[PDB]
Amino acid sequence: ASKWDQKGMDIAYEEAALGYKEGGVPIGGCLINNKDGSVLGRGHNMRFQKGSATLHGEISTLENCGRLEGKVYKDTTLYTTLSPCDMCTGAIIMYGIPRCVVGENVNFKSKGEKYLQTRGHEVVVVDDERCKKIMKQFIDERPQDWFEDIGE
Amino acid sequence: ASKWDQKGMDIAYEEAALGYKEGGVPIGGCLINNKDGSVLGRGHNMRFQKGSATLHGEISTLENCGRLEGKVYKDTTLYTTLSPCDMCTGAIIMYGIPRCVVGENVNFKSKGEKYLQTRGHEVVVVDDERCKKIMKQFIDERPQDWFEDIGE
Ligand SMILES: [Zn+2]
Ligand SMILES: [Zn+2]
Ligand SMILES: [Zn+2]
Ligand SMILES: [Zn+2]
């Protein structure tokens, strides 16, 4: 188990709330070193902020950590407020991030959640009410923008 | 769709060469509309040019296409000079881009190449010598730089 999960999810939610305030998709996250709990980086979806088709919450988080030597990712945990799509799932796998803690998978979920476990990654779903509340609201008020974010 | 394959790879290779000239990783791409052969966008890896951990040739290409309605990707072809990693593979899957034409899978390949087929996509490996030559030259000269790109 990990002692940094509360810290990790609070930060990810903090990013999601910020993104929502800026008028974008309420999905945030952060990357943490499991051994000491240091924050390698944090971020949120930037589709609307930067007119970006690739900056999902998880991707923005990884971009914010900057260029890193492959070994650095090997003992970290990626925290995301929502279960990852196939692209973000791919990012986790490609870099070898061993653990993914998910805020919730009620508002959204792809084959990536199971694929992660099939590829040997540990996935933890906390079922956080805050995350579920803000994401459901966005989906309700701006469904068209939501679908654009998941290619639908 | 196949009729634009020579054009698509030409552009993808031009992007790779340009990126190489810029001192970066020689991997390029472009997304073409299967209907009229129009180029929605083209790009190359920007790791060195912008200190980016997510802008692989494929991701950069999609970013350069700009925000698009989910339906637009459903009938396009993504050309990449090199077989996609799990992240870029995931991007193709999430957006529903039906075809992925690859320059070569000799210098590199991931489980994504096949996963794309399992997920219902069409994969075509042309074995382009221009692509293989410039990529092998890069790996030979700057191996550490290459490994960083694939998180190793
Ligand atoms: Zn997502
Ligand atoms: Zn995603
Ligand atoms: Zn690649
Ligand atoms: Zn890639």
Coordinates of C-alpha atoms and ligand atoms in Angstrom, one line a residue:
Chain A
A1 CA 0.0 0.0 0.0
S2 CA 1.0 3.7 -0.3
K3 CA 1.1 6.3 2.3
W4 CA 1.1 9.1 -0.3
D5 CA -2.3 8.5 -1.8
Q6 CA -4.1 11.1 0.2
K7 CA -1.5 13.7 -0.8
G8 CA -1.6 12.5 -4.4
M9 CA -5.3 12.7 -4.9
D10 CA -5.7 16.0 -3.1
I11 CA -3.2 17.5 -5.5
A12 CA -4.8 16.0 -8.6
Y13 CA -8.2 17.3 -7.5
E14 CA -6.7 20.7 -6.8
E15 CA -5.5 20.7 -10.5
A16 CA -8.9 19.6 -11.8
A17 CA -10.7 22.4 -9.8
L18 CA -8.2 24.9 -11.2
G19 CA -8.8 23.7 -14.7
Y20 CA -12.5 24.1 -14.2
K21 CA -12.1 27.6 -12.9
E22 CA -10.1 28.5 -16.1
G23 CA -13.0 27.1 -18.2
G24 CA -11.5 23.8 -19.2
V25 CA -12.1 20.1 -18.6
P26 CA -12.1 19.3 -14.9
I27 CA -9.4 16.5 -15.0
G28 CA -6.2 16.9 -13.0
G29 CA -3.3 14.8 -11.8
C30 CA 0.3 14.6 -10.5
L31 CA 3.3 12.3 -10.5
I32 CA 4.9 11.3 -7.2
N33 CA 8.0 9.5 -6.2
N34 CA 6.9 6.5 -4.1
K35 CA 10.0 6.4 -1.9
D36 CA 10.0 10.0 -0.5
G37 CA 6.7 11.4 -1.7
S38 CA 8.1 14.3 -3.7
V39 CA 6.0 15.8 -6.4
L40 CA 7.7 15.4 -9.9
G41 CA 5.0 17.5 -11.5
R42 CA 1.3 18.3 -11.7
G43 CA -1.2 19.5 -14.3
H44 CA -4.7 19.5 -15.8
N45 CA -6.3 19.2 -19.2
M46 CA -5.4 22.1 -21.5
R47 CA -7.7 21.5 -24.5
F48 CA -9.4 24.8 -24.1
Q49 CA -6.6 26.8 -22.5
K50 CA -4.1 26.1 -25.3
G51 CA -6.3 24.7 -28.1
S52 CA -4.5 21.4 -27.6
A53 CA -5.7 18.0 -28.9
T54 CA -3.1 16.1 -26.9
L55 CA -3.0 17.7 -23.4
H56 CA -5.3 15.5 -21.4
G57 CA -4.8 15.8 -17.7
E58 CA -2.4 12.9 -17.6
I59 CA -0.4 14.1 -20.6
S60 CA -0.2 17.7 -19.3
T61 CA 1.1 16.3 -16.0
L62 CA 3.9 14.3 -17.7
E63 CA 4.8 17.3 -19.9
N64 CA 5.1 19.4 -16.8
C65 CA 7.6 17.0 -15.1
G66 CA 9.9 17.8 -18.0
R67 CA 12.5 15.6 -19.7
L68 CA 13.5 12.8 -17.4
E69 CA 15.8 9.8 -17.5
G70 CA 13.7 6.6 -18.0
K71 CA 14.6 5.2 -14.6
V72 CA 12.9 8.0 -12.7
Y73 CA 9.4 6.8 -13.8
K74 CA 10.0 3.3 -12.6
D75 CA 9.1 4.0 -9.0
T76 CA 6.4 6.6 -9.1
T77 CA 2.6 6.7 -8.9
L78 CA 0.5 8.7 -11.4
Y79 CA -2.6 10.2 -9.7
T80 CA -5.5 11.1 -12.0
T81 CA -9.0 12.3 -11.0
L82 CA -10.6 10.2 -13.7
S83 CA -9.9 6.7 -15.1
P84 CA -7.5 7.1 -18.1
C85 CA -8.5 6.9 -21.8
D86 CA -6.4 4.6 -24.1
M87 CA -3.8 7.4 -24.8
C88 CA -3.1 8.3 -21.2
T89 CA -3.1 4.5 -20.4
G90 CA -0.4 4.2 -23.2
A91 CA 1.7 7.0 -21.7
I92 CA 1.8 5.2 -18.4
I93 CA 2.8 1.9 -20.0
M94 CA 5.4 3.5 -22.3
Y95 CA 7.2 5.2 -19.4
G96 CA 6.8 2.3 -17.1
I97 CA 4.9 4.1 -14.3
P98 CA 4.1 1.0 -12.0
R99 CA 1.1 2.4 -10.2
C100 CA -2.0 4.5 -11.0
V101 CA -4.4 5.8 -8.4
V102 CA -7.8 6.8 -9.9
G103 CA -10.2 9.2 -8.3
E104 CA -13.2 7.6 -9.9
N105 CA -14.4 5.5 -12.8
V106 CA -18.1 6.2 -12.7
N107 CA -18.3 9.2 -15.0
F108 CA -15.9 7.6 -17.5
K109 CA -13.9 4.5 -18.1
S110 CA -12.1 2.9 -21.0
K111 CA -10.4 -0.4 -21.8
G112 CA -7.3 1.2 -20.5
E113 CA -8.1 0.6 -16.8
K114 CA -8.1 -3.2 -17.4
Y115 CA -5.4 -3.1 -20.0
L116 CA -3.1 -1.4 -17.4
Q117 CA -3.6 -4.4 -15.1
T118 CA -3.1 -6.8 -18.0
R119 CA 0.2 -5.2 -18.8
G120 CA 1.3 -5.6 -15.1
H121 CA 0.4 -2.2 -13.6
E122 CA -1.4 -1.7 -10.3
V123 CA -4.6 0.3 -10.5
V124 CA -6.4 1.7 -7.4
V125 CA -9.8 3.3 -7.6
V126 CA -10.7 5.5 -4.6
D127 CA -14.2 6.4 -5.6
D128 CA -13.7 10.0 -4.5
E129 CA -17.0 12.0 -4.2
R130 CA -15.4 15.4 -5.0
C131 CA -14.0 14.1 -8.3
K132 CA -17.2 12.5 -9.2
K133 CA -19.2 15.7 -8.4
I134 CA -17.2 18.1 -10.5
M135 CA -16.7 15.8 -13.5
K136 CA -20.5 15.0 -13.6
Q137 CA -21.3 18.7 -13.6
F138 CA -19.0 19.4 -16.5
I139 CA -20.5 16.5 -18.5
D140 CA -24.0 17.8 -17.7
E141 CA -23.3 21.5 -18.7
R142 CA -21.0 20.9 -21.7
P143 CA -21.5 17.4 -23.1
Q144 CA -20.3 18.5 -26.6
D145 CA -17.0 19.7 -25.2
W146 CA -16.7 16.5 -23.1
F147 CA -17.1 14.3 -26.2
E148 CA -14.5 16.3 -28.1
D149 CA -12.1 15.5 -25.4
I150 CA -12.6 11.7 -25.8
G151 CA -12.8 11.8 -29.6
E152 CA -16.6 11.3 -29.7
Chain B
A1 CA -7.0 5.9 -48.9
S2 CA -4.1 3.9 -50.1
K3 CA -3.6 6.3 -53.0
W4 CA -2.3 9.0 -50.7
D5 CA 0.3 6.6 -49.1
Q6 CA 3.2 7.9 -51.2
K7 CA 2.4 11.5 -50.5
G8 CA 1.8 10.8 -46.8
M9 CA 5.2 9.1 -46.2
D10 CA 7.0 11.7 -48.3
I11 CA 5.7 14.5 -46.0
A12 CA 6.3 12.3 -42.9
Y13 CA 9.9 11.8 -44.1
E14 CA 10.4 15.5 -44.9
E15 CA 9.3 16.3 -41.3
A16 CA 11.8 13.7 -40.0
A17 CA 14.6 15.2 -42.1
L18 CA 13.7 18.7 -41.0
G19 CA 13.6 17.6 -37.3
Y20 CA 17.0 16.0 -37.8
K21 CA 18.4 19.2 -39.2
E22 CA 17.0 21.0 -36.1
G23 CA 19.1 18.7 -34.0
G24 CA 16.2 16.6 -32.7
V25 CA 15.0 13.0 -33.1
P26 CA 14.3 12.1 -36.8
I27 CA 10.7 11.0 -36.5
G28 CA 7.9 12.7 -38.4
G29 CA 4.3 12.4 -39.4
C30 CA 1.2 13.8 -40.9
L31 CA -2.6 13.2 -40.8
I32 CA -4.4 13.1 -44.2
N33 CA -8.1 13.1 -45.0
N34 CA -8.7 9.8 -46.9
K35 CA -11.4 11.5 -49.0
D36 CA -9.4 14.3 -50.7
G37 CA -5.8 13.7 -49.7
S38 CA -5.7 17.1 -47.9
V39 CA -3.1 17.4 -45.2
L40 CA -4.8 18.2 -41.8
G41 CA -1.3 18.6 -40.2
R42 CA 2.3 17.5 -40.1
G43 CA 4.9 17.4 -37.4
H44 CA 8.0 15.8 -35.9
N45 CA 9.4 14.9 -32.4
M46 CA 10.0 18.1 -30.3
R47 CA 11.8 16.6 -27.3
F48 CA 15.0 18.5 -28.0
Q49 CA 13.5 21.5 -29.8
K50 CA 11.1 22.2 -26.9
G51 CA 12.3 20.0 -24.0
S52 CA 9.0 18.1 -24.3
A53 CA 8.4 14.7 -22.7
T54 CA 5.2 14.0 -24.7
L55 CA 5.7 15.5 -28.1
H56 CA 6.6 12.3 -30.0
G57 CA 6.4 12.6 -33.8
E58 CA 2.8 11.3 -33.7
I59 CA 1.6 13.4 -30.8
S60 CA 3.2 16.5 -32.3
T61 CA 1.4 15.8 -35.6
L62 CA -2.0 15.5 -33.9
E63 CA -1.2 18.7 -31.8
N64 CA -0.4 20.6 -35.0
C65 CA -3.8 19.6 -36.6
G66 CA -5.5 21.6 -33.8
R67 CA -8.8 20.9 -32.0
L68 CA -11.1 18.8 -34.1
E69 CA -14.6 17.2 -33.9
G70 CA -14.3 13.5 -33.1
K71 CA -15.9 12.6 -36.4
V72 CA -13.1 14.2 -38.4
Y73 CA -10.5 11.5 -37.4
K74 CA -12.8 8.6 -38.3
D75 CA -11.7 8.7 -41.9
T76 CA -8.1 9.8 -41.9
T77 CA -4.7 8.1 -42.1
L78 CA -1.9 8.8 -39.7
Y79 CA 1.5 8.4 -41.3
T80 CA 4.5 8.0 -39.0
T81 CA 8.1 7.2 -40.1
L82 CA 8.5 4.8 -37.2
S83 CA 6.2 2.1 -35.5
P84 CA 4.3 3.8 -32.6
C85 CA 5.0 3.3 -28.9
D86 CA 2.2 2.4 -26.5
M87 CA 1.4 6.1 -26.0
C88 CA 1.1 7.1 -29.6
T89 CA -0.7 3.8 -30.3
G90 CA -3.1 4.8 -27.6
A91 CA -3.7 8.2 -29.2
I92 CA -4.7 6.6 -32.5
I93 CA -7.1 4.3 -30.6
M94 CA -8.7 7.0 -28.6
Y95 CA -9.4 9.2 -31.6
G96 CA -10.6 6.4 -33.8
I97 CA -8.1 7.1 -36.6
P98 CA -8.8 4.0 -38.8
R99 CA -5.4 3.7 -40.6
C100 CA -1.8 3.9 -39.5
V101 CA 0.9 3.7 -42.2
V102 CA 4.4 3.1 -40.9
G103 CA 7.7 3.9 -42.5
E104 CA 9.6 1.1 -40.7
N105 CA 9.6 -1.1 -37.7
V106 CA 13.2 -2.2 -37.9
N107 CA 14.8 0.3 -35.6
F108 CA 11.9 0.1 -33.1
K109 CA 8.6 -1.4 -32.4
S110 CA 6.3 -1.8 -29.3
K111 CA 3.3 -4.1 -28.5
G112 CA 1.2 -1.2 -29.8
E113 CA 1.7 -2.2 -33.4
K114 CA -0.3 -5.4 -32.9
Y115 CA -2.6 -4.0 -30.2
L116 CA -3.9 -1.6 -32.9
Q117 CA -5.0 -4.5 -35.0
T118 CA -6.6 -6.3 -32.0
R119 CA -8.6 -3.0 -31.5
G120 CA -9.8 -3.1 -35.1
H121 CA -7.4 -0.6 -36.8
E122 CA -5.5 -1.1 -40.1
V123 CA -1.7 -1.1 -39.9
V124 CA 0.6 -0.9 -42.9
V125 CA 4.4 -1.1 -42.7
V126 CA 6.0 0.1 -46.0
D127 CA 9.7 -0.5 -45.0
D128 CA 10.8 2.8 -46.3
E129 CA 14.6 2.9 -46.7
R130 CA 14.8 6.7 -46.3
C131 CA 13.3 6.4 -42.9
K132 CA 15.4 3.5 -41.8
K133 CA 18.6 5.2 -42.8
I134 CA 18.1 8.5 -41.0
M135 CA 16.8 6.8 -37.8
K136 CA 19.6 4.3 -37.6
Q137 CA 22.0 7.2 -38.1
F138 CA 20.5 9.0 -35.1
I139 CA 20.5 5.9 -32.8
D140 CA 24.2 5.3 -33.8
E141 CA 25.2 8.8 -33.0
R142 CA 23.1 9.6 -30.0
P143 CA 21.9 6.4 -28.3
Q144 CA 21.2 7.9 -24.9
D145 CA 19.0 10.6 -26.5
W146 CA 17.1 7.8 -28.2
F147 CA 16.5 5.7 -25.1
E148 CA 15.2 8.8 -23.2
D149 CA 12.5 9.2 -25.9
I150 CA 11.2 5.7 -25.2
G151 CA 11.6 6.0 -21.4
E152 CA 14.4 3.5 -21.1
Ligands
ZN1 ZN -8.7 11.3 -19.5
ZN2 ZN -6.5 10.6 -21.8
ZN3 ZN 7.5 6.9 -31.5
ZN4 ZN 5.3 7.5 -29.2

